[PDB]
Subunit: 476 residues, 4 copies
């Protein structure tokens, strides 16, 4: 079908233009002032509002397993939520059983997504163990399946955690495949010791989750991951930046040389972790994810500052909330609570409120950190995250003045609590368009189950590897 | 006129693609892999070489031995297809008269497109009205103020606050020459009384501390008023760090290292050869710390410094010999208009610090976004001006005073072996450099007018005005 | 007289030991466990409590008709654990320093309860100021002078005047003190804030942002590093200005910072109070930071050593004296309280939290100050031959600061309601018990002026070497 | 026996005072101007020269040249006490390696000494031996390792276990901070580039791997709330890590050694293999020649606190074992004799710090940290008679021909130092008097140290109450 957006302000990461936009066959066909349109073309009046590239959520965990349970938002309900929020593409993390085949787990995830997802999607593969025969499955995943990003774990002792030797092995190998190396960075050995100590103190409430994983343990694992990456000369991507001190580590490392990228998630940019000390156990357990929200209320603004000057580059969600019934498995033991929070619907609205409405960054920067930087990093740039002739027709009409108060009483998630409850945000989407067709307009949702396509990603993204290739020949 | 570039790797600041570039009528007309062009169309084979937008030198002092023709000629040889030259009036005289004088001399001599900075050497009565004329009528959106040169060009803190507020009202880019003029004065007296008269005394009267100080004062003023500030000629680690730290906090500060400070250091002031030492004399001075050119490049790579310039101001040995007995009398300027893109490439891309995309960003694209010239300049895209360089990353160039396109006897990058230089240069749809042959037209360059309120700078300012109040 | 403290834990900046202290004729005579002494001596049982040197407040403005005179202040200082203060002499711009110093000296010698020394504030760099500075140093015994970068066309010196003053004071071997705020920029913000329609005390904080302090501080350091002299930054009030100092200390320049009890204990959210009289009580220069995270941050820097001394900047004014600027914030008199609360606030923020130990507490309340200003080991040390200015400190004695209980006539206390975990029990000054079990036994005019010698070693030993080191020269060519 | 120093300017960490010092029975008995003394006393005129406390070298590896020639060299150098590292096999007992170290030193040492015990493996049964060492044997300092994979290296969990136990014992926890797991991989990477020379040592242990391990060591200690001590700070990048932590809270102490303060690692690239091998120590000397300057500044402002030497003497023949593989070259440099002289030259003569700070970083701070103050590191009545008369003008140029070591190469070769010891008194005996050496083998005493040094543990005690 065919569609035309008249009289808008097109925002890209590089510039802004007043021009009309014409979409046909799931692509942007023309951009200009006086356009030539063929057959049955529907017209949408933009009225001077911003025309931006639909968001790319780099970090989603829609079918994440934790404590024997699956996240409450599946691929259908998850991506339904994303679209309402202005997110037109996600990259979901595939989470294999430690020891199980990556291929088998990839097909399971692909099957579930292709039948339920409302929007285009890519997949990360989380390498949960460095087992014998893992290297051949990785090669197939890069060259045949179309996956260019793999996540390794420094936390979760004796479950997901890799040693310093194993990390070195895996960074080198993935570097050879030209993959983006994602890292969940928290010291798992110290966490294990601290959880043990806190429980034995009598502290069973969700606060103990935040006390057993203070920001220092994140700062350390982040620095350790950057050190390894700089030895090997490969790009390293830090997922779920939750702390001012981990962000400072990333910042300092970018001055020194190492190719490091940082990804705060909506949670860390929106709220803080003081809610762990809530008298309401249910509410407090809804905030539980790893790494935890910082109990320092000054973190959200500090992270947004770093996102503004370029030290943090992409935003995500880390969306994997559980239902109150699900979480209450850990009523007498915080380590038994399912880790995950919401963010997928709120991500662009939240980034906007903290970064643009406050004046820290402009609308051009907002586009980079919600979609464009993500596409450059993961090798999707011309296709996704740009309003250009030839690119996919994933567009959002954004109203910088439209008010929205985030509540669990109106959110498109299955869970009872929302970590941004009562946050009054100054800037919301009006119209969201996915794959050429309108999915959200005037508060009405028209999404199709299974309509999203899997987007394959080529190895060796130039944004990351162009500097790697040069540093290889300088080294020797 | 009609031109086609086959088999080149097109390099913008955002992505790189293998495609042909098709030029006609002063603009890029088409980009694609299999371009169907008329028979007989003049074709250039790039053969895997890089196709980058021609550089934009943001800091040039050509007008104040080498004329404006020779300057843009050397620019073009080095890959710079646009300059922004600084208008320098005597303090008290009309800005309009000095602008018109510059504009005339350039329009008849410039080989490449150009814009103009106007330096506000004095905040005299009646300067506000002239500034409105320069912005709305004359197409100038950038102005430099000085904090150095006591009793000559220097503006007090009260004056600077007034100037920044008024210039914020116009939507102008405020450039700053940041050194403490009052303290430099005291340091000049002390060094002269010590018997030091040679050019080494110019570096000791202007230590990096005094630079870092004025830079910080400049940012402080800008942060209070809520206006962007642009720091010209970043020469020192300490000043650079001030800028890198202020970016993180809030204020809208931009740094411009010049080729000189990226390529060489200031140990050459201590040479036994007076004529060699004197050639390095500029303000602010090259840091005597040899670790400076790497550090600066590192900040360019991460994003703390944004644009590169040259600070080009050619003086002959005879013209420099004026200060043979007093370093404060030595004319201030170095070379670099030609070497700029070659030096930046060698220090930042050849070493591995950054890639070819960020190279384009620091040599053209960022300057365009800042001074309101994008996407007209600094991008290879349909509709943009045909200012295109066929860059060869492996082509050897040795910088010398024998082969360079200037009448000055000494080069500050003398002996520097670079790996990556221009092969073919295209300005306004026409080939001006090819196979070592220069083919430039005297007076061919057009003046480019720049609107006020560059979106890159002022969109944040606009939002901040609503928030802070 | 003659006094013996037994069973106490003597705490100096360098170590802590269990011993008894024996005082005689205002000096410490013996320290040991089995002291052989006369058997008719007055004796105080400490019971394992801390015996620390009496504090030194390096920043007071008591002589500015006031609600509290020099006597009420020094009485309050003693009760709070402070046994010596260094007051600023504030002359008229253009007038004589010698004349104003004698006026301050006269009033102080007849009112002071405790020992005292005097800072001389150079309000103007007038023709013939150099001759009087030599006199104050060589004849009167003043080694510290404050210059102002703030207050345009009143106290402010230009960059050129500062360089001139710094070089001349270096030659004298004086401690250069600096009130660092950009005067010119404050003026511009003052005009703008008032035109906005803001007349309240909140406008004081808005016209003097923390970035304007930071700037002047960096400038002051930049000048001091070039001349090679020690610079002392009074009233460090902001995170940004404390960082400038921390950084400069690593680069070379001999810079010292002085946070006051105010900036370590409370913030400036109270400027935005509905109650005008309360908000006006907080008004001082530089202002308290609206950033509530500031007092902790500064205490951290005190504890790692980037800040060295604590003062109070005490300048007492009644609610009726403040009300001069009820319709204009710039006319409000600048001054807060803290001469009585200083050591209690510093302890509660620094030692009760675990940031520093009792030993560093001694360093930051007396010893460092003494070293800097050339009063060591006369003051700031419990050692044989040192002055008998002793305090018996109980690390667990609760004290709630209120306007009802404070030793002052002022209606408002900036530390109002703050609960503290460490107080003074016994305070001894010149060998006489001046505070015991709540009882205040002071003597008006008892306090001696202390002359301070030029060229204190703690600052100028490094200067004397760097002068000889000053390498790199013009080439012969 | 009995001794009197007149006309001298006593320099302590806190003040300087012109006064005379009287020594008797190995202690300092009187300090004053006109002292009443017995008749049979030797009088030394100081002539306005500096009278400072003898140095404390906190980092020596003499038994890993013997104990006698080292403490001789130390004495000559100004250092009147060293703290030597007891290094066991990961197949030997701490109790036995201790007594083997103790018996060797007590019969050879010229100056007073204390012992560190290096915990090379966290084995089952170690906790009992440690309780013996603290309570019965007089050791309050222990060093754990994060480098040397599968030999000395402890896992993070073992560090956690170890830091906790040691904190309960009231000890000083020393860390050798380099990442062993990454070093091993970088060794291979450099060997397969065909670099076998000593320069391969510097390249296989870049500073990033030290800074990482330091930061991880600090991070652990902050969770446990114990004081942590970083030995052999060799890099700006590690030194910054330490600097930044100090202002954030954690109780961290850093010990640059004379080598990293006085020279750099450009000498690994020397054409003469024997010389470059002589510079091989771990962590390596930084190839960055800005390092020694940077490190001395950090010593000046207070971010580094004590100076050691890491003195580990190997002859050229013993170094030759790794002529074809840098990984087999024994790690050790010299510095026990030079430590004070070098520190004076780089810190005091440059004007970064004054003589008072000089005493701090050469003795006093050490004494505070390891619980030897005010017995050591202070000229005061009752304190030990370990005095040095220091001449700030006396030239000492450093050469392998002149030094008191059987090694062929000196890492401070040809450094011209202004400022050196004139007289050196140890235990109230003159052992060095302007070139004239008179030491006695075995005269040095073992000095036991108590647990819970207040300099470190006063703040821990408080932080134990506040956190929970």
């Amino acid at each position: 079908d065919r569609l035309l957006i008249k009289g808008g302000r097109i925002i890209n990461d590089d510039q802004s233009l007043y021009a009309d936009v014409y979409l046909e066959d799931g692509l942007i066909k023309q951009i200009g002032e006086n356009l030539i349109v063929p057959g049955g073309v529907k017209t949408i009046e933009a009225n001077g509002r911003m025309v931006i590239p639909g968001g790319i959520d780099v970090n989603t965990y829609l079918q994440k397993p934790s404590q024997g349970m699956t996240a409450a938002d599946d691929f259908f309900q998850g991506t339904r939520a994303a679209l309402v929020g202005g997110t037109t593409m996600i990259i979901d993390h595939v989470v294999p059983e430690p020891g199980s085949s990556l291929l088998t787990s990839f097909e399971k995830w692909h099957e579930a997504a292709d039948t339920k997802s409302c929007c285009d999607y890519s997949l990360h593969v989380d390498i949960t163990s460095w087992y014998d025969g893992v290297r051949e499955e990785l090669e197939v995943l890069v060259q045949d399946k179309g996956v260019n990003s793999f996540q390794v774990y420094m936390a979760y002792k004796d479950v997901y955690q890799m040693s310093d030797s194993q990390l070195y092995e895996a960074f080198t190998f993935l570097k050879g495949l030209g993959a983006v190396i994602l890292v969940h960075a928290e010291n798992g050995d110290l966490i294990a010791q601290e959880q043990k100590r806190i429980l034995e103190m009598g502290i069973t409430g969700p606060e103990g989750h935040a006390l057993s994983r203070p920001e220092e343990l994140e700062a350390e694992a982040v620095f350790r991951a950057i050190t390894i990456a700089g030895r090997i000369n490969c790009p390293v991507y830090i997922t779920k930046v939750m702390s001012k001190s981990a962000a400072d580590i990333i910042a300092l490392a970018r001055k020194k040389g190492p190719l490091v990228f940082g990804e705060p998630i909506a949670a860390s940019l929106g709220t803080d972790g003081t809610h762990y000390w809530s008298k309401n156990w249910a509410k407090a357990a809804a905030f539980v994810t790893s790494p935890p929200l910082s109990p320092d209320p000054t973190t959200p603004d500090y992270l947004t500052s770093l996102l503004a000057c370029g030290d943090l580059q992409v935003t995500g969600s880390g969306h994997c909330p559980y239902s109150t019934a699900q979480k209450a498995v850990g009523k007498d033991n915080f380590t038994l609570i399912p880790e995950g929070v919401n963010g997928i619907e709120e991500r662009m609205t939240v980034v906007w409120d903290k970064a643009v409405a406050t004046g820290k960054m402009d609308e051009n920067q907002f586009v980079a950190v919600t979609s464009t930087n993500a596409a450059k990093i993961f090798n999707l740039y011309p296709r996704k995250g740009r309003i250009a002739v030839g690119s996919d027709a994933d567009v959002v009409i954004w109203d910088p003045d439209k008010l929205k108060t985030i509540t669990a009483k109106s959110h498109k998630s299955a869970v009872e609590y929302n970590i941004f409850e009562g946050m009054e945000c100054h800037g919301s989407p009006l119209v969201v368009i996915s794959q050429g067709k309108i999915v959200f307009e005037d508060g009405n949702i028209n999404v199709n189950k299974g309509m999203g396509r899997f987007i394959p990603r080529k190895a060796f993204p130039e944004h990351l590897y162009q500097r790697v290739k040069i540093r290889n020949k300088v080294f020797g």
